Amino acid sequence: RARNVRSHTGEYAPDILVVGSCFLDYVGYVDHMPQVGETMHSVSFHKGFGGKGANQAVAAGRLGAKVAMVSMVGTDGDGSDYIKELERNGVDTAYMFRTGKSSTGLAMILVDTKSSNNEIVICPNATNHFTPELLRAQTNNYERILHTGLKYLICQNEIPLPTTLDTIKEAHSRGVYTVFNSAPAPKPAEVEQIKPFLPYVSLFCPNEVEATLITGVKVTDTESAFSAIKALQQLGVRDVVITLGAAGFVLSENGAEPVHVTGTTGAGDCFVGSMVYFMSRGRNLLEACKRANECAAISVTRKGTQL
Amino acid sequence: RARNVRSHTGEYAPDILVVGSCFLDYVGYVDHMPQVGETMHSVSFHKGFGGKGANQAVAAGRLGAKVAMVSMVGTDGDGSDYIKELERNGVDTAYMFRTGKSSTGLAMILVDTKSSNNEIVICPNATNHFTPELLRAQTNNYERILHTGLKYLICQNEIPLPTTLDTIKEAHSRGVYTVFNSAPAPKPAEVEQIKPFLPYVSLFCPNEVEATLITGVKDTESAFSAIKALQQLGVRDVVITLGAAGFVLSENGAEPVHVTGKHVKAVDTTGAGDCFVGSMVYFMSRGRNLLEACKRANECAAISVTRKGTQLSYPHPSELPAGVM
Numbered sequence: 362r363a364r365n366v367r368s369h370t371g372e373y374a375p376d377i378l379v380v381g382s383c384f385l386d387y388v389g390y391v392d393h394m395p396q397v398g399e400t401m402h403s404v405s406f407h408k409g410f411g412g413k414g415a416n417q418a419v420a421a422g423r424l425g426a427k428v429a430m431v432s433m434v435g436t437d438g439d440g441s442d443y444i445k446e447l448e449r450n451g452v453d454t455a456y457m458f459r460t461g462k463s464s465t466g467l468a469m470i471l472v473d474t475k476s477s478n479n480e481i482v483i484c485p486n487a488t489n490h491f492t493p494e495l496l497r498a499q500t501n502n503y504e505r506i507l508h509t510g511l512k513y514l515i516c517q518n519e520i521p522l523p524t525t526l527d528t529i530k531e532a533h534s535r536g537v538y539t540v541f542n543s544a545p546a547p548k549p550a551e552v553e554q555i556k557p558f559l560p561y562v563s564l565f566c567p568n569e570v571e572a573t574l575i576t577g578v579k580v581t582d583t584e585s586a587f588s589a590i591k592a593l594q595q596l597g598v599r600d601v602v603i604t605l606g607a608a609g610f611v612l613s614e615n616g617a618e619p620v621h622v623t624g625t626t627g628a629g630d631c632f633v634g635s636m637v638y639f640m641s642r643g644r645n646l647l648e649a650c651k652r653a654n655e656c657a658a659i660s661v662t663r664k665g666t667q668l
Numbered sequence: 669r670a671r672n673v674r675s676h677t678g679e680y681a682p683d684i685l686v687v688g689s690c691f692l693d694y695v696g697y698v699d700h701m702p703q704v705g706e707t708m709h710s711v712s713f714h715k716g717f718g719g720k721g722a723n724q725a726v727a728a729g730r731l732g733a734k735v736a737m738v739s740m741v742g743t744d745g746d747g748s749d750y751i752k753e754l755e756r757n758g759v760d761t762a763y764m765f766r767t768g769k770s771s772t773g774l775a776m777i778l779v780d781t782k783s784s785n786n787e788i789v790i791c792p793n794a795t796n797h798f799t800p801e802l803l804r805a806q807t808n809n810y811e812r813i814l815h816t817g818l819k820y821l822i823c824q825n826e827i828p829l830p831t832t833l834d835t836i837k838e839a840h841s842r843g844v845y846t847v848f849n850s851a852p853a854p855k856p857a858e859v860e861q862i863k864p865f866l867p868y869v870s871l872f873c874p875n876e877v878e879a880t881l882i883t884g885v886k887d888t889e890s891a892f893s894a895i896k897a898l899q900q901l902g903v904r905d906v907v908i909t910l911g912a913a914g915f916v917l918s919e920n921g922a923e924p925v926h927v928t929g930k931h932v933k934a935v936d937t938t939g940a941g942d943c944f945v946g947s948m949v950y951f952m953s954r955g956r957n958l959l960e961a962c963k964r965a966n967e968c969a970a971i972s973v974t975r976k977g978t979q980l981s982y983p984h985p986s987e988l989p990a991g992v993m
């Protein structure tokens with residue numbers, strides 16, 4: 362077993378649960394994009410650990426969080442490699458599920474540094490079979506992962522939507538503080554499914570496009586972001602944070618006067634996971650988001666020295 | 669340790685040594701080929717075991733060969749998965765080398781569902797470090813992998829060329845029968861390096877393109893003259909594969925023979941050449957002469973083209989019609 366094991370007494374039960382995606386990033390650096398029928402060689406290769414769920418868990422884990430990842434990977438060696446990497450970055454893996462019927466999720470990424478263009482083919486693989494029915498079957502209808510000590514759930518939109526939404530609803534019903542980063546951007550039929558679950562979301566943390574798709578408010582600046590915050594509170598979200606990329610973020614804590622704070626692969630994931638870590642340490646939303654925003658800049662720098 | 673362990677008595681020393689590539693095949697099926705700047709999802713994904721070296725070893729292993737793979741993979745999960753897969757296909761992995769400084773070699777392969785065309789980016793990764801100097805350092809200057817009873821070496825052209833050429837020379841000098849399948853096709857600088865080593869090649873088994881690049885000779889009758897060119901360059905036995913026109917061969921300079929392709933309905937020919945080479949050597953290790961071995965290899969390759977899956981399409985004995993084994 363690569364995975365952690367829970368105790369009978371629950372003495373290592375997490376403060377933060379992340380229910381989401383784990384994808385390996387297979388990055389081939391090429392002198393040009395392949396044309397149809399072409400066999401070529403890479404000039405360099407790099408294997409990375411991604412998926413927004415793993416990214417957000419690892420962000421928290423690297424700051425010391427008592428975080429656990431709930432996801433699905435393969436029984437393949439790639440799955441084993443992810444499980445170990447999560448442990449080495451402070452993420453408990455006891456509730457990582459493994460399937461022999463699918464490969465671990467991955468993205469195949471081609472990069473032309475010359476032209477600095479990309480091509481990306483996302484292969485969620487095992488992820489696609491991470492359904493609410495399977496989750497419930499493996500967790501005694503969520504009882505195994507939503508223990509009484511649990512303070513935070515983080516979800517994204519990179520696993521089957523019903524799994525994300527049903528988990529949010531169940532955690533919220535137990536008094537868990539639920540955090541939903543709706544990334545990647547929801548499609549029209551996903552927006553429709555999401556809206557009735559928004560009353561079970563303690564904290565909705567979209568970027569501008571995501572806020573635009575959910576609320577129908579065109580978010581391009583602080584003013585429109587503040588309007589989106591209102592639209593989201595009306596849909597029943599308690600706390601809102603809308604990230605504005607490099608231009609900072611806006612937030613409202615439980616309907617108080619919104620606040621604007623002034624200002625890259627996976628920087629957003631670093632922000633979200635860091636934010637929850639700080640909240641788990643007792644910071645309020647604003648304090649957590651300022652600290653998260655700084656962690657996110659430090660992450661970009663640290664990342665830049667490695668690649 | 670996933671890898672096999674040798675005994676001090678040489679109890680399990682192989683009859684056939686394959687010194688070549690192991691690549692994981694990451695196969696993404698897509699609605700269309702990604703355009704520049706496109707992010708898409710696959711329709712489905714398939715993980716396969718490839719590399720011409722492993723393919724050829726596995727072809728032989730599946731027929732029951734006492735075959736061992738010499739290659740380089742990662743300490744990663746892909747590495748461990750290949751090492752187990754090889755054992756499950758009857759290939760000894762005692763001389764599989766592992767590096768923690770590189771990932772396992774892989775091919776990223778996109779397959780268009782409609783047009784059935786491919787785009788392929790090869791990432792040799794650990795394979796790039798599979799050098800003569802490293803091979804020597806890990807085998808006591810080849811002593812550990814070239815024991816007396818070793819009968820056959822198989823090489824391709826999917827590792828560093830010096831590793832291939834130096835191994836062929838050392839094996840040949842110990843009286844091992846050396847098989848060299850120059851695939852993928854050698855590049856111009858590779859052709860110049862290879863030609864001086866052809867006297868150390870017992871059996872050269874190129875396709876048409878590859879024979880052309882090596883010989884200077886550009887169908888059956890030109891293939892026959894390419895054979896003569898290769899014998900002159902020092903190659904003892906020659907087999908040139910012709911895709912659909914079967915193949916031509918000459919044993920030790922005897923009158924060439926042409927053998928017709930088995931006319932089957934080819935659904936997926938991926939790895940079929942590798943099937944032919946590995947199967948050929950297997951049959952020679954069981955005592956068949958070159959023509960007999962290639963006829964049986966031909967039957968095996970024919971069976972492989974009737975289904976998808978590359979190594980998975982390679983037959984096991986129980987699956988074969990009578991008169992192949």
Ligand SMILES: [Cl-]
Pocket residue numbers: 362363364444
């Ligand atoms: Cl495990």
Ligand SMILES: [Cl-]
Pocket residue numbers: 408409410411
């Ligand atoms: Cl990484």
Ligand SMILES: [Cl-]
Pocket residue numbers: 462463464486487713714
């Ligand atoms: Cl899969």
Ligand SMILES: [Cl-]
Pocket residue numbers: 669670671751
């Ligand atoms: Cl091992």
Ligand SMILES: [Cl-]
Pocket residue numbers: 715716717718977978979980
């Ligand atoms: Cl396979």
Ligand SMILES: [Cl-]
Pocket residue numbers: 406769770771772793794
């Ligand atoms: Cl590498």
Ligand SMILES: [Cl-]
Pocket residue numbers: 979980981
């Ligand atoms: Cl099989």
Ligand code: NA
Pocket residue numbers: 422423424425426451
């Ligand atoms: Na820690």
Ligand code: NA
Pocket residue numbers: 422425426427428450451452453
């Ligand atoms: Na931790």
Ligand code: NA
Pocket residue numbers: 457458459460
């Ligand atoms: Na499991």
Ligand code: NA
Pocket residue numbers: 462463490
């Ligand atoms: Na399944």
Ligand code: NA
Pocket residue numbers: 729732733734735757758759760
């Ligand atoms: Na065997």
Ligand code: NA
Pocket residue numbers: 798799800828829830831
């Ligand atoms: Na070399």
Ligand code: NA
Pocket residue numbers: 936937938940972973974975976977978981
């Ligand atoms: Na086939």
